[PDB]
């Protein structure tokens, strides 16, 4: 009945009411509307490094959704350099308690949609999708790349393009949760993103 511009590329704000916690105010920018599940949006919220998947129009936790008129920037950066980081295993330095710089092994997956000066990155010990302006880490010397790496993703078993196909995650407690493959990483074709129904995060998996 209607064909319209979607909200990908727009700035948004909305309340977030969950459990018994008080209401917070979220602001972010919509990166993608998932083709295989168009109720699902991928959002980078401000002040949150982890990328969220939310059914913005259906999720009861999302209150008074509003599209902001604010425009998204296209910052000046070394493009070839940015491209050269894609697919690289890295050692990413973070600040640890109590005074200890920590090295997190990670894998740069892609330049993010919409905010293309930011990078999709996941970590071996924390295999969900994160987003940073990595060139500022690399310039500050907090990003060492590992040209010859042995990187481990969590494994997804099969049983033929997988995006759009459903999964179950069988937990150690014997319970299961449902999800679906929403993305195949262009630079790393055996690596996929999965969204579980019961969880906000975007999970990064590899195929055998």
């Amino acid at each position: 009945s209607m064909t319209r511009r979607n909200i990908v590329g727009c700035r948004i704000q909305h309340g977030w009411k969950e459990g018994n916690e008080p209401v917070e105010q979220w602001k972010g920018t919509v990166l993608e509307q998932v083709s295989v599940k168009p109720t699902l949006y991928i959002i980078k919220y401000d002040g949150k490094d982890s990328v969220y998947g939310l059914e913005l129009h259906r999720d009861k936790r999302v209150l008074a959704l509003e599209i902001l008129p604010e425009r998204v920037p296209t910052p000046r950066i070394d493009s070839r350099l940015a491209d050269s980081l894609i697919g690289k295993a890295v050692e990413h330095v973070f600040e640890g308690e109590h005074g200890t710089k920590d090295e997190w092994k990670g894998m740069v997956l892609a330049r993010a949609p919409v905010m293309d000066t930011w990078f999709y990155i996941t970590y071996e010990k924390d295999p969900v999708l994160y987003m940073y302006t990595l060139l500022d880490d690399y310039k500050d010397g907090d990003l060492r790349i590992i040209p010859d790496s042995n990187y481990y993703f969590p494994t997804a078993e099969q049983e033929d393009s997988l995006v759009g196909k459903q999964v179950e995650h069988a937990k150690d407690d014997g319970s299961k949760r449902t999800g679906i493959f929403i993305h195949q990483v262009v630079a790393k074709p055996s690596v996929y993103f999965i969204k579980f129904d019961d969880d906000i995060h975007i999970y990064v998996y590899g195929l055998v």
């Binding site: 949150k48 490094d49 330095v93 973070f94 600040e95 640890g96 710089k101 920590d102 940073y132 880490d137 500050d140 907090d142």
Partner: peptide, 6 residues
């Protein structure tokens, strides 16, 4: 240098 959040 980045802070790691929960």
């Amino acid at each position: 240098a980045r802070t790691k959040q929960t």
